[PDB]
UniProtKB/Swiss-Prot annotation, chain E:
SUPFAM superfamilies: Nucleic acid-binding proteins, Translation proteins SH3-like domain
Protein name (Swiss-Prot/TrEMBL): Large ribosomal subunit protein uL2
Any single GO CC term annotated in Swiss-Prot or TrEMBL for this entry: cytosolic large ribosomal subunit
Keyword Cytoplasm annotated: yes
Keywords: Cytoplasm, Ribonucleoprotein, Ribosomal protein
Gene3D superfamilies: 2.30.30.30, Nucleic acid-binding proteins, Ribosomal protein L2, domain 3
Keyword Cell wall biogenesis/degradation attached: no
InterPro entries assigned: NA-bd_OB-fold, Rib_uL2_dom2, Ribosomal_uL2, Ribosomal_uL2_arc_euk, Ribosomal_uL2_C, Ribosomal_uL2_CS, Ribosomal_uL2_dom3, Ribosomal_uL2_RNA-bd_dom
One GO-annotated biological process of the protein: cytoplasmic translation
UniProt region (Disordered), positions on chain: 206-246
Lineage summary: Eukaryota, Amoebozoa, Evosea, Archamoebae, Mastigamoebida
Cellular localization per UniProt: Cytoplasm
RNA sequence: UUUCACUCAUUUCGUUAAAUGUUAA
RNA sequence: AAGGUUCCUAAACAACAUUACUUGGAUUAGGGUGAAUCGAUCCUAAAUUACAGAUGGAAAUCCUUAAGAAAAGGAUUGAAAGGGAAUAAGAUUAAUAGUUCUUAAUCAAGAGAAAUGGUAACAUAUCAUGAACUUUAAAAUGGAGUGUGAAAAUCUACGGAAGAGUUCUCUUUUCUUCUUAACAAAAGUAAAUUCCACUGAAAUGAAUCAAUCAGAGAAGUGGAAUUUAUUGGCUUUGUAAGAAAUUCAAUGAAUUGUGGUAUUUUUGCAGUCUUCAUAAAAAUUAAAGGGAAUCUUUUGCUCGUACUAAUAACCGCAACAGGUCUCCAAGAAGCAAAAUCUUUAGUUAAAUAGAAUAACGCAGGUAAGGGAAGUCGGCAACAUAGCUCUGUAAGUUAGCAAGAAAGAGUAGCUCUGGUGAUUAUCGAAUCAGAACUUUAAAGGUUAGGGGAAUCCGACUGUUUAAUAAAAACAUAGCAUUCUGAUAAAUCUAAAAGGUUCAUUACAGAAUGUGAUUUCUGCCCAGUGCUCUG
RNA sequence: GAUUCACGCAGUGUUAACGUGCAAAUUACUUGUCAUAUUUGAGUAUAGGGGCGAAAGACUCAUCGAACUAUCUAGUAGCUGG
């Protein structure tokens, strides 16, 4: 697994056509946007709610989105 | 304390059978296989360990980047900088002496 | 520390006074440092029987088994130098 | 300790199954079969071993083809 | 009787040489035109310890007088050689320690080592530690020179036999007294199986001709003819003399 | 042993297959004397020596 | 028959069978 | 390794496990072993075996690259402990799991006039061309001892959360849980070593537990590199809390800090010591010198994989007190991996029991007074036993004897002082001393009897498996003999055959004596050996 | 190739136990030893007038002052038994 640092790369990754799945996890302090690509599982630790919403709109509707919470699926 | 067992079927404390015991979720301890300690490179003349090149297994050098298996210099990776400096002076001073000694003295 | 058994006190009391005497002279000269013929430093120490290495000088010299230069091996170098000079001159 | 105690370390086979005769007579270190005389081209037979001849010879097996020819 | 220990030595089963960590064959390089009519220069890369022998070995590196590459040789060190030294082999080589010269060019009285008994056979005589041979005289009529072997014997060789000037390194090795049985055990690490030697008188009559009776003694003279068969040739052979020398 | 050659393992398997008794129906054949297999063996009784 | 001189069988060697011998330069 | 279905389950108990058995490693019938990443397969070591050639009456033997129109250079085999491309955590089965499942990775083979920076050491998500040929390095190198970095375990400091135990006597109490992988990232921050630049050291300095180093250049300041169980060593981060552990409720909820100038283990590093010991090779990989030429995706085959590994699965006729190679390793106490007791795990059965409590036994003990008077002989048993301090002879190879011999102290409780770190706070077991008390103190366990002489062997070592462990053998030291290598010794029927010999007289081969000190007397007739006669 | 303890190992003594044994050589205590001439696994080499032996005629599959196995062989017996 790899970790992306700032906001610019994740959108470029999201807009890239190499995506396969997206899973969003909400923790007691932050929100993680794990993007499942072909090779790696990129993740992004987000602590700003407004910036998280911007990310959620950036997700193409065709891809499958999994929401994870205190109870695992 | 938690006691462990060999995971592979080797049962002797050989050089290639080294292990490390690390902790794991639930308090259990698991067994890893650690790599052998390797030597680096040596100057072709003075036999000193070269700087700038890691001490890894021979095959792992191919995995490294092209710039990470050598030093950007003449005879880089096979001769130390001191080894190289003596080479240049020998090649220049002896040749210059040959022009004065012989070759229209 | 010791009256007279200096280096051969590690042999204790079990090899004969005469044998411990002979081995003392050889072991003292085998473990001492010698003047290095190329850099004039007391930095030559034996590595193996017949091989001597200059520590702070980076040279390997072939020599005697326990001494850097043997008496027989020193006169020979003198003899060859005289022979070479006579041959080179007429 | 030449009796009971010395037999503790007997865990290294000397002979394994041969390929030409099927018996456990292939010497590993000698690289030969003690019974049928392997790689030696001829089958190992001795006139002092008259019984060993009648244990493995012509007619002691299937005779898959020879039985047809002689009857022919 | 049995077969004695000297008989079992000639079969070479456990008496084979323990030569696994040895460096190799130590000898001059093969003769060629450039050694017959010129000089080839070699570089003493390093001095190494060869197991089983008391003299150090030099890893000389000549270049390649006829092709491209290196000619890694393996000489026997002469006393005084050092790493990085240049040595010259050939008929025109200077008379310096470590140089290889034909035995005819050496002035009478020169001390040489690693001499070839026959031209081009790459060294026979004077190869142990501290040993050397002296040139006695020349004979230009039949191209022969006389040398004095380290045993004192005089030998006549052809004047073009090669030899190295100097003294084999590591002299004075045997003057240090072994003190312990264990030390002698380690001496034969890279040699043959000979060390713990049982006296013939301590054996039995089947084992040895000396194997005695109710008193440990020989019984018959220990000086024997050279023609005795293997098996009874035990002791002094063809002894011209016995007893302490005066 | 845990480690074995392929051919050796198959010869082990046959010895397992041959360590069986007479089926009941074969015992009811007319003029049948083969009631028990006298070539049988067990691991702790006789070592098959292979 | 002895003593010689040679090599040509023969012996013992060495190499990548890598300038041997004689002229020539 | 060896065994070979003994593994799991069900039915069943005729036989077997010296009684019995509803039990079983026993009977009957089913089920069970999943790999691109672990091994074999690949490479070579000691060694082994072919065609042709040589030898032999023959069978067959030799040779292993030398003899060959064979093989740029030398053929086959030889390691489940040597070398080696690449996988981990959780869950799952009556039984398989680095092999299955979920998640997350890695590796190999494929498919879609040619660069900058730094003074320098050197540095740059593939970048930034690099053929023949040649070289260098890695794979790939003994052992001892000291110091030290890091991780884990144990112990402990502060702060807690949940559960459990004790509770008429107290105990803010005692115990349990508080975790995290492969592979990668680079907030923060280490120890050690080696180099680079400036400068030039004497009034010589720098440094370690020890060393060791310097005008072929120290110390100082500023840098570069490598190592530290994967990336880059440790904390931290992604994986990742969604798992797992501890609780609670009836599937759903809670928590998952920070440290230590403590001990052990593991793993590296640094120098020091030691050898008449110098402590493997190849497959395979990279770099250099030279200048010839102009991210996505597919596939990863064959074989092993069950179980025991032993006071019941192996070898001894067997469920035999014998034997058989390894990995992991808690607390007390102590110098100690010792004896003794306990926690996690395992087991209470391992060739039958009950009653009575005779003789004679086997094993463990004690004993008045005397103390070897017993006996071939102090055989057996008794006795000494730790640590500290004082003290220690003759003899001697001057190293030892020596723990010589001999004497005193030692418990519990309440205190006092010495030995540091950091800059008032914090921390370590160690030593010394003083009052008081008692049953006067190493002793539960562990734990030398000592002295005066004589003989033999110098010593450490080895030895008649199964009646001899020794004064016997070995040993170092001393001495003698032969041999210049086409030799000496010596195996073979023979041999471009073989061993010492990858050797060369400081060597090879054959013998006697047995450290050191002192000394080895006379005899060459006899028998050997020899002569340059 | 110093002195000792421990894991181990050996076999000095009791000439203890057992001696139709746990065992065709073991058990208990005592004793010694317990890393460099050390201990040990696998592979490999050496074969019967041969090997191997720090030497006891020791070891060479419970067999060694000449192994095991088969043929000559129903070897011969002035000797014993029937």
């Amino acid at each position: 697994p790899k970790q992306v640092q700032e906001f610019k790369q994740i959108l470029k990754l999201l807009k890239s056509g190499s995506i396969r799945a997206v899973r969003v996890k909400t923790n007691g302090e932050n929100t993680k946007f794990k993007v499942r690509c072909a090779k790696y599982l990129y993740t992004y630790i987000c602590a700003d709610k407004a910036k998280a919403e911007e990310l959620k709109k950036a997700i193409p509707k065709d891809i499958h989105v999994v929401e994870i919470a205190k109870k695992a699926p | 304390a938690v006691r462990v067992t060999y995971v592979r079927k080797h049962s002797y404390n050989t050089k290639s059978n080294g292990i490390r015991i690390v902790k794991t979720a639930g308090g259990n301890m698991t067994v890893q296989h650690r790599q052998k300690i390797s030597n680096g490179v040596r100057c072709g003349d003075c036999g000193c360990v070269l700087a700038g090149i890691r001490h890894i297994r021979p095959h792992q050098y191919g995995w490294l980047g092209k710039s990470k298996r050598t030093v950007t210099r003449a005879y880089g990776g096979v001769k130390c900088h001191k080894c190289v400096q003596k080479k240049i002076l020998r090649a220049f001073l002896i040749n210059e002496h040959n022009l004065i000694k012989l070759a229209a003295a | 520390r010791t009256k007279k058994v200096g280096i051969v006190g590690k042999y204790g009391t079990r090899y004969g006074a005469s044998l411990r005497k002979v081995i003392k002279k050889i072991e003292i000269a085998q473990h001492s440092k010698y003047v290095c013929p190329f850099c004039c430093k007391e930095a030559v120490r034996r590595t193996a029987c017949g091989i001597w290495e200059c520590k702070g000088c980076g040279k390997q010299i072939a020599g005697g088994a326990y001494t850097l230069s043997t008496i027989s091996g020193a006169t020979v170098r003198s003899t060859v130098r005289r022979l070479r000079d006579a041959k080179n001159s007429q | 300790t030449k009796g009971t105690s010395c037999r503790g370390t007997r865990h290294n086979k000397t002979h394994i199954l041969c390929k030409r005769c099927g018996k456990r007579s292939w010497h590993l270190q000698k690289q030969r079969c003690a019974s049928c005389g392997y790689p030696d081209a001829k089958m190992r037979q001795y006139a002092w071993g008259y019984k060993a001849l009648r244990r493995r010879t012509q007619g002691t097996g299937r005779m898959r083809h020879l039985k047809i020819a002689l009857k022919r | 009787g049995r077969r004695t220990l000297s008989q079992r030595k000639g079969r070479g089963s456990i008496f084979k040489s323990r030569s696994h960590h040895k460096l190799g064959v130590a000898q001059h390089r093969a003769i060629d035109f450039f050694e017959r009519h010129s000089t080839v220069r070699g570089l003493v890369k390093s001095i190494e310890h060869d197991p089983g022998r008391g003299a150090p070995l030099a890893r000389v590196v000549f270049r390649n007088p006829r092709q491209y590459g290196l000619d890694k040789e393996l000489f026997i060190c002469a006393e005084g050689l050092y790493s990085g030294q240049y040595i010259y082999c050939g008929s025109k080589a200077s008379l310096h320690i470590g140089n290889v010269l034909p035995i005819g060019q050496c002035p009478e009285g020169t001390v040489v080592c690693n001499v070839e008994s026959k031209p081009g056979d790459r060294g026979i005589i004077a190869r142990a530690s501290g040993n050397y041979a002296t040139v006695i005289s020349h004979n230009a009529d039949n191209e022969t020179t006389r040398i004095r072997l380290p045993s004192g014997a005089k030998k006549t060789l052809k004047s073009n036999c090669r030899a190295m000037v100097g003294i084999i390194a590591g002299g004075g090795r045997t003057e240090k007294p072994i003190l312990k049985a264990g030390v002698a055990y380690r001496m034969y690490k890279a040699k043959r199986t000979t060390w713990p030697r049982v006296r013939g008188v301590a054996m039995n009559p089947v084992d040895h001709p000396h194997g005695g009776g109710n008193h440990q003694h020989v019984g018959h003279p220990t000086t024997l003819k050279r023609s005795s068969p293997p098996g009874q040739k035990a002791g002094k052979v063809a002894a011209r003399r016995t007893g302490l020398i005066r | 042993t845990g480690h074995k050659g392929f051919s050796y393992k198959l010869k082990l398997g046959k010895k397992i297959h041959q360590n069986r008794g007479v089926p009941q129906w074969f015992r009811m054949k007319t003029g049948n004397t083969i009631n028990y297999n006298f070539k049988r063996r067990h691991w702790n009784r006789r070592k098959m020596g292979m």
